[PDB]
Amino acid sequence: MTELCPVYAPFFGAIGCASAIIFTSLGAAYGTAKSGVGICATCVLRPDLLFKNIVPVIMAGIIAIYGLVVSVLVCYSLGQKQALYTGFIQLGAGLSVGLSGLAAGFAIGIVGDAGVRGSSQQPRLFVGMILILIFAEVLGLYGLIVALLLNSRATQDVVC
Amino acid sequence: MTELCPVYAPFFGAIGCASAIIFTSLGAAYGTAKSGVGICATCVLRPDLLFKNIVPVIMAGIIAIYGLVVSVLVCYSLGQKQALYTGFIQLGAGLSVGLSGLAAGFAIGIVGDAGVRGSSQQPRLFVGMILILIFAEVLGLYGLIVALLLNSRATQDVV
Amino acid sequence: MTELCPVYAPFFGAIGCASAIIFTSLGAAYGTAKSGVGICATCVLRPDLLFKNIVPVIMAGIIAIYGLVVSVLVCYSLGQKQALYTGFIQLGAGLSVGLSGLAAGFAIGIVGDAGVRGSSQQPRLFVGMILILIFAEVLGLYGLIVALLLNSRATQDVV
Amino acid sequence: VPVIMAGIIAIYGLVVSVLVCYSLGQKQALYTGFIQLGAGLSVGLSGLAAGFAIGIVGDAGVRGSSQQPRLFVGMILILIFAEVLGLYGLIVALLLNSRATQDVVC
Amino acid sequence: MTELCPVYAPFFGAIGCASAIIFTSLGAAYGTAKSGVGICATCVLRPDLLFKNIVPVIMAGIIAIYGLVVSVLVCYSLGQKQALYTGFIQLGAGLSVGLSGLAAGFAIGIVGDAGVRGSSQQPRLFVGMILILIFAEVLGLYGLIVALLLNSRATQDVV
Amino acid sequence: MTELCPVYAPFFGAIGCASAIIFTSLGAAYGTAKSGVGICATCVLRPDLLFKNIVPVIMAGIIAIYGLVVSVLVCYSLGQKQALYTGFIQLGAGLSVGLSGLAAGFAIGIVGDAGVRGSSQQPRLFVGMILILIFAEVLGLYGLIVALLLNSRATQDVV
Amino acid sequence: MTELCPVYAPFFGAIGCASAIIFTSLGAAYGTAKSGVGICATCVLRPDLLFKNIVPVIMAGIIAIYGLVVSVLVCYSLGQKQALYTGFIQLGAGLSVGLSGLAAGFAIGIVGDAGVRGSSQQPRLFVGMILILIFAEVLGLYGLIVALLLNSRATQDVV
Amino acid sequence: EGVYFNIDNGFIEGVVRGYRNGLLSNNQYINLTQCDTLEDLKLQLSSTDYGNFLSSVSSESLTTSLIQEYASSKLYHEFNYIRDQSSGSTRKFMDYITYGYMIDNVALMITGTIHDRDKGEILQRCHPLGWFDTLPTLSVATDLESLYETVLVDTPLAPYFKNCFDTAEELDDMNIEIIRNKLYKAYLEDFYNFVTEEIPEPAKECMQTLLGFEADRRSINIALNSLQSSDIDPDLKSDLLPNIGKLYPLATFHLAQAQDFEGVRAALANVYEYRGFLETGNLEDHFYQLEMELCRDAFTQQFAISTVWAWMKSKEQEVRNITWIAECIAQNQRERINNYISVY
Amino acid sequence: YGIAQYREINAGLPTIVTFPFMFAIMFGDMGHGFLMTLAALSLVLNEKKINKMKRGEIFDMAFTGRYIILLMGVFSMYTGFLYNDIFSKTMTIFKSGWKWPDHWKKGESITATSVGTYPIGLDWAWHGTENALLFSNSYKMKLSILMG
Amino acid sequence: DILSSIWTEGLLMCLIVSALLLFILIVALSWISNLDITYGALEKSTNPIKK
Amino acid sequence: KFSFSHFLYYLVLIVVIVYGLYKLFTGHGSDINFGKFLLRTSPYMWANLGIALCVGLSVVGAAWGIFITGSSMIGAGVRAPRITTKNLISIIFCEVVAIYGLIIAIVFSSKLTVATAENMYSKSNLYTGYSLFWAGITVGASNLICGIAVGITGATAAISDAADSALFVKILVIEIFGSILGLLGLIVGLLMAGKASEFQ
Amino acid sequence: SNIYAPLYAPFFGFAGCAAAMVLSCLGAAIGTAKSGIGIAGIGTFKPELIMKSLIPVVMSGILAIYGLVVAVLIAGNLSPTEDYTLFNGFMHLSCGLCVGFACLSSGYAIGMVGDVGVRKYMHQPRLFVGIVLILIFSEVLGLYGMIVALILNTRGS
Amino acid sequence: EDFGDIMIHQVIHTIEFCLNCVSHTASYLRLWALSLAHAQLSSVLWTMTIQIAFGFRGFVGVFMTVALFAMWFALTCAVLVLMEGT
């Protein structure tokens, strides 16, 4: 081993690779359940509108895709002889997306459930809640771009 | 031994094998337990829902199999000669699959309870419950696929 | 001693069997107690069906024998000159089985609690009770499968 | 029946303690010390779990009889499994202690 | 390694660059999540609130833009061969703006819920609610100023 | 200094002396509070037992002073050149006495309140209260009798 | 610089004095607060009772006075060039007195809580009341005597 | 410390405090008393925040019963609006407030087994606070035994059952009175248990003390009036009495084991806080007067539900005074003008 | 479990065959199977009067399936026969042939080559150390999957 | 020469602040997880007088 | 005990002493030392982030101030519209602390300068690092605890005004008495900071 | 430089510097916060005694000046040009520890006691004389903390 | 012709069978697990009974052997059969 490329950097590399999936997936599942309870509650009352209010869960389901793309993009660059600089960035990259996805999932899960539950009274509340839910998921979007250039400069400044 | 193959490297490999099935078994158990009370409460009222409420209970077994398919795969790569790199790559996959399965089990039980709650009141809704259940399976394999990607890939390049 | 086998290698193997049996014992005890309380509470007004209501506890008992068999299997391969590999893989298998058994025990107890209430009205849903609760032994037994799979590799030479 | 059946876990612990005490020394291999450490707790809190299980069900069983005279035979079947569980700690520990003796180096 | 550049400098740069967006994500999520429930609760009975007083949720991401701009612009000035003096300032710049965003967003969200709930029966003073809510949205400007200050300081010395 | 007299031996003596008193003090406070509140509440209705229901505080004071007795009988066996053996035994004495006094105080506090509640109904009930509470001060007696024996064996060969 | 005169010895000399006032102040504050609330309760009804039930306030202040006097006393005889043997003893005495005052405060407040209200109705309780307070605060002097006894032996055998 | 309070319950405090500020003092009451005709009273009221919704609504057919109906309607609307802006814990708490109401509502429904008084008309006069939409009483067998489980499942009042299975098949006066007695006992006991373990600190003392006062006045009324038109064994006297009065746990037995007028006088006169069977004009009027002094004290904090709990009864007392004046005005017997209490 | 729809095949023969063989392959101790079958024979021979006498609470279902335990055991003894276990004992019915040195001190791994194993069942050679168990488990975990 | 790098790290300076970071993260988790939902606002019970 | 968190706190509080005894009973007891650790770390380390932490805590407290006041200000505004203009002064008294925090960060900037390849571990500037970091934490904590009080006083005043328009002016004193806290925190922090010249 | 004066001496001086003020400020904050509700509660029932009931906030304010005095007494006392003896840092730490807790206890007591006193002073004016006496009896604790801090600091100046 | 429920039903049937094949494949290991468990428990009971009974003594050892023999039957018939078969 050498000071710039020790043997325990792969620990940080692997943790960064495997950490993005965890928290994003947790937030996605949380939102999925916390919103699907609302759909189940409204369906019996309204067996007429059951294929027009599935936007919250599906929008909550893209953060998982985001966490997976970042994860695999980091993973395909996995090897033994990597600079400690290589292992340093990856953990931060993974955890950033993980917790950003968790945060987005919480908000989408609660807001979608509330909106779909309340929409049964007034019809036009649908388009009203669409914008807020899509912006909630856009909040999740904002983490991925940062992770992108983080990965890019994980190697654009390769030295040793 | 050589810095790249320390003595404690296979400790990670051994622990991850157990953890990968543990973090899925707990989730599956919780989900099936949550579904069981609801199905038992409902069936007595409506005497036909036994057969058309089997989905979540089998999805629990699917998560259980999801545990084993990855757990066994990592076994044969273990040993006293592999690098600490091997332990890292093993534990990463193990934790990924375990936590993804835990999230899946946490969501599936609640959604299934909610769906079966209205089952006795909407005999029409004998497929609409599976809607979210499968849509809740979007993340049901991301951990599995990433674990398979890591294991079979980093199982070489000892140096 | 040599880096292959430090002094306290057998400590891990010794603790492994104890933990393996002990976690399963806790899980089985919890499940059986929480189920039997309900069964005996309910049977007072339905005393005729006592025997057909006993299946849950005899079911739950199997986790204990799983723990016992895995513990004795591990104990058969204890020693101080063994490899540290053969000190960690043992505890890995043991804790895997223990935690799987604990999860299965909680699930079985939770399901059985409401199962008897469901059967308290009519006898048809005996099949429903068994069907819903008969998906936990697979979870409890997957741990045993992986444990015996792991400990098989233990026998290989220490060098 | 409940209290007497709960008592025998004490006998279980007593026999294990006496057997361990039979074979205590100072020049023994640390291997044996670890073995005894494992066996002690393995029996101990297994018995604790069995006691916790039997306690919650004894109270439920006793009151049931007040109205159902022949639930007596029923409830004993349930309570047997508690001691069946408890016996496993003892069976594993006795053989673990036996194993702790032959394989020695000092 | 050496005073001019200890080997472990980039770790803190990475975690600091992460921390900014890490905190702003939660800061915006809390406010948006509360405001959504505040809106859907009220607009149901007064279903013409969409265009007039939904500006808070719109501003929810406005403050979150810091987590991007500062995080990247400090990601513009990183490297391995960096001095410890400039190796930990970026962590300060990172967490400062992130926690400032958290604090600003939480209060913005609570007061937005307050205003939306109040405006329904009092469509008279929301002109007050908006002009008061802004005062809570200018705090993150301080985070921007301090981040620019520290990033400029880093640019002065780049080894 | 030498292995038989490390420079930090008086640590154990000092802490043991402090414990020999403070833990009994806390129990005395607890017991006096618990009994006093009840006796003072009930006596308002009818003063006829003030000079007869006063045993609780007396017992609390007795247990308190026993801790002081042991602490002082340890206090005049102190110095700088005492072996760590002395510190060990001094710690043991204080630990034995203080918490036993705590237990006695708790017992008297929890008993005397109900005792004074019940005494009013039957004026011939002190003949049972004194007999029942005897055990608290006898508990103090057991707590104190053992402690002094530490001093009794404290001096045959020190250093 | 000897093994009996480490540079970290005067730490305890400076701290033990500091800690003594702490717990006495805490106990005095708690007791005084919970007595003031009670006297405020009892005063409005049956007014014209100010200097009749205010004694427990002064009684509590006595402990604060104890703490001040002990702290200043130790402050007289601290040391920068001293022996660690004295250092430990000073801290031991300080914590003993502080904790004893803390223990006394709980009783002095709680008992007075019930005592203050009873006087308004039955005036045959005030003298019966103060007995509990006095027999509880004997504990404070019991602590003080051991504190000063330990402090006395600290003035000798300093290297 | 109360710092955490204003994380979800700010506007609750704001609206309750504003409505409390809307209370009418004795200065408005004296002016309202001088009015003689119903129109004069209504127009005088219209000059207050309490009015503007009762007058200018009818066709000058103002009666005391209609006055009470309309006056209480706005309080119900305020309560339901606060429900419409509720919170999780606040919602889980409001059910407790409504429990004491649908207790009597379902008691009336049970009584209406052989008379068959419709649900709607019962709601026209009973307390709508207790109404829950899932109450199909006069649609299936209204037999109290058959309807026992239907009500048990309709609303979760099952835990409030203290051996309610037997002696629940009478459809008689004794049964209907004892069911209400037991229901109040269990409800107040469980509410006291709940608040004592799950509620913010500032309410911990106010709620328990006010509950104790109400439970005491409730327990006395079932002992004083147990010797007025009927008799019962002391065992049932103890049974119907609350387990803990929260002001006296010893005199409750003294009341129970006594069956004469003066076997209970000491039990109440010992506490030296309320006179024993004295200072009695309209007993409930004096109860209101004593309770409102505490209710006003509850309006001094700003970080507990004590404000809401006291304001619920403050508005009801406003309606009580309005009815006390309307009774003497509409019926034209000017003897209740001075019979009203106002401490706000 | 449930009735079948009209003209839907019933699994009578599957219940007659598979379930008993499954139970047999669960465990095959010779003594246990024989002892269990003893009660079955006693019940079936006393069925002359048991059929009419009152069935005890614990004996109702027992008498219901008296003919099932017979199949259970008659298959259990065969299933255990191939395992050559009688309370963990074996008389070495057949011969397989195994190679050993003239003398050997234990504590050493000893290799014996195969010249033909038992035509029926497994040879006694797997009564040795953990090697026998770690071979038998691997052998048996495969036939279960194949038969399933 | 060097600190005790076996029982504890030698390069411990890089993990002391991670404790504070995780403390802040967990405090945020606790504060977020208790958010109210206001079920009662959207739900009611119809009455001839209240409604 | 009753909670997992308290159980963990007990466990750590006992294991720390267990470890201390274990080392002390090996004949050692001085192997771990405060001074060596304090010298190990870079003096820049604590001046890097305290300059950030102080402002962070101050702005957090300012945020809590509005968090509290706003929910009451308009909760009362619904009753009458004659409050908002007369009430905004309370929130102004809130964001003053934000400027107060800004002052510290803007001033501390000039102190930080890269020093030589050596000499940083001398007492010349390690003192400066400690001073800057602990002044920053002082000022941040003071601002937080002052913001709590100002916010709660504003909340109570908002609901008290509706009782009497002649009450707002008379109740205005308490929040100023609170803001005294922020002023004193600022002065003590500036005094603590100015003493140290700068990093060498 | 000196075996008794390591290079980390300023640490335990600045510990006292910061602690002596932070906790006093916190005590003042809690006291004033509680007194705010205590006063605002009785506003609508007796809008004349608020002036006569401003004593608690004034008394609480004394904590802040106490803390500032004790802190500044040592602020500037040290100096980068000299590494004062570590004992002289222990004394600073003790100063901060003493004052920061005496002030906190005083503030805690005065807060609630004045709260209740002013709460129920609305009935009659004859409680003022006892409320003030108890409040001063409470503030004596902060006085004690101040004096002990001063005496210990004078020692080993 | 075409109707939604039947396509949904056949989709769920496809997926459920595609997973049930592997589920059944996996489930078959419990057979062997129970078999080996029975083997091990029988072996350990034999070891702890017969070896203990082998105490060589004709004056008091015969009665000990009788007692051990009786309890060995008591356990073999009761707990090594009933629970296992059930």
Side-chain angles (χ1 to χ4, degrees), chain H residues 67 75 150 218 248 257 290 308:
Chain H
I67 281 165
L75 170 55
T150 71
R218 174 51 175 68
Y248 53 98
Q257 66 204 359
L290 188 53
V308 192

Side-chain angles (χ1 to χ4, degrees), chain B residues 1 7-8 10-11 14-15 17-19 21-26 28-30 32-37 39-41 43-50 54 57-58 60-61 64-65 68 71-72 74-80 82, chain C residues 3-4 12 83-86 88-89 91-93 95-97 99-100 102-104 106-108 110-111 114-119 121-122 124-125 127-129 131-132 135-136 138-139 142-143 145-146 149-150 153 157-159:
Chain B
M1 297 188 287
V7 300
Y8 44 80
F11 162 75
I15 297 300
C17 293
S19 66
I21 66 154
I22 284 159
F23 292 166
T24 68
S25 59
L26 281 293
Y30 183 77
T32 184
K34 204 43 51 193
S35 73
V37 55
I39 190 167
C40 178
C43 65
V44 61
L45 276 296
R46 178 165 283 181
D48 70 1
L49 60 84
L50 187 153
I54 304 292
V57 299
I58 64 154
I65 301 307
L68 294 174
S71 183
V72 65
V74 294
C75 282
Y76 292 165
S77 297
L78 298 188
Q80 313 184 150
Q82 298 94 25
Chain C
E3 78 293 19
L4 271 296
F12 290 58
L84 204 66
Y85 213 80
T86 50
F88 293 104
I89 61 173
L91 71 87
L95 60 93
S96 71
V97 162
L99 274 79
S100 62
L102 188 139
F106 291 167
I108 297 169
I110 289 172
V111 171
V116 68
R117 275 70 174 175
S119 63
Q121 280 57 236
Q122 76 294 24
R124 66 199 271 252
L125 73 163
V127 295
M129 293 177 70
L131 172 43
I132 183 63
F135 287 14
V138 296
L139 271 293
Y142 284 20
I145 297 169
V146 66
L149 188 153
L150 294 174
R153 298 194 72 188
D157 48 356
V158 299
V159 184

Side-chain angles (χ1 to χ4, degrees), chain K:
Chain K
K1 174 61 179 66
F2 52 83
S3 76
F4 57 92
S5 293
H6 286 84
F7 176 75
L8 299 175
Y9 294 121
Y10 306 153
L11 264 289
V12 61
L13 286 171
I14 62 172
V15 76
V16 293
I17 299 299
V18 166
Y19 174 78
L21 175 138
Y22 168 73
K23 183 57 65 177
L24 180 57
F25 282 7
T26 314
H28 300 288
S30 56
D31 297 352
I32 180 62
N33 191 358
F34 38 83
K36 68 180 190 60
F37 167 66
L38 268 295
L39 269 294
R40 170 70 271 170
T41 315
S42 162
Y44 297 133
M45 185 64 72
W46 300 353
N48 302 139
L49 62 90
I51 183 174
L53 264 291
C54 69
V55 174
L57 208 55
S58 71
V59 301
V60 166
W64 292 98
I66 318 304
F67 181 76
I68 300 295
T69 52
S71 66
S72 64
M73 293 177 71
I74 55 163
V78 61
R79 184 77 176 178
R82 59 89 173 174
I83 306 296
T84 61
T85 314
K86 184 139 181 175
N87 196 355
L88 60 89
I89 178 174
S90 69
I91 61 163
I92 303 301
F93 269 103
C94 189
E95 71 271 14
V96 298
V97 309
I99 311 293
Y100 281 143
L102 187 153
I103 301 299
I104 315 311
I106 186 166
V107 285
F108 286 2
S109 63
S110 299
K111 298 298 191 294
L112 295 183
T113 53
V114 63
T116 58
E118 62 89 21
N119 168 269
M120 62 295 288
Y121 290 100
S122 73
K123 57 182 287 293
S124 67
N125 48 2
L126 182 73
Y127 167 96
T128 71
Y130 300 154
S131 63
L132 194 150
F133 181 75
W134 269 27
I137 190 167
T138 288
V139 63
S142 69
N143 290 318
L144 183 63
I145 59 174
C146 180
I148 292 295
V150 74
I152 202 162
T153 61
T156 187
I159 52 177
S160 74
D161 190 2
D164 175 8
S165 180
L167 187 145
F168 168 92
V169 179
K170 301 173 178 64
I171 204 174
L172 198 73
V173 292
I174 61 175
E175 56 276 13
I176 290 169
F177 283 115
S179 173
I180 293 173
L181 298 182
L183 277 296
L184 302 189
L186 187 149
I187 190 167
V188 62
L190 188 53
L191 173 49
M192 201 155 178
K195 192 73 173 65
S197 71
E198 68 164 357
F199 275 75
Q200 309 301 313

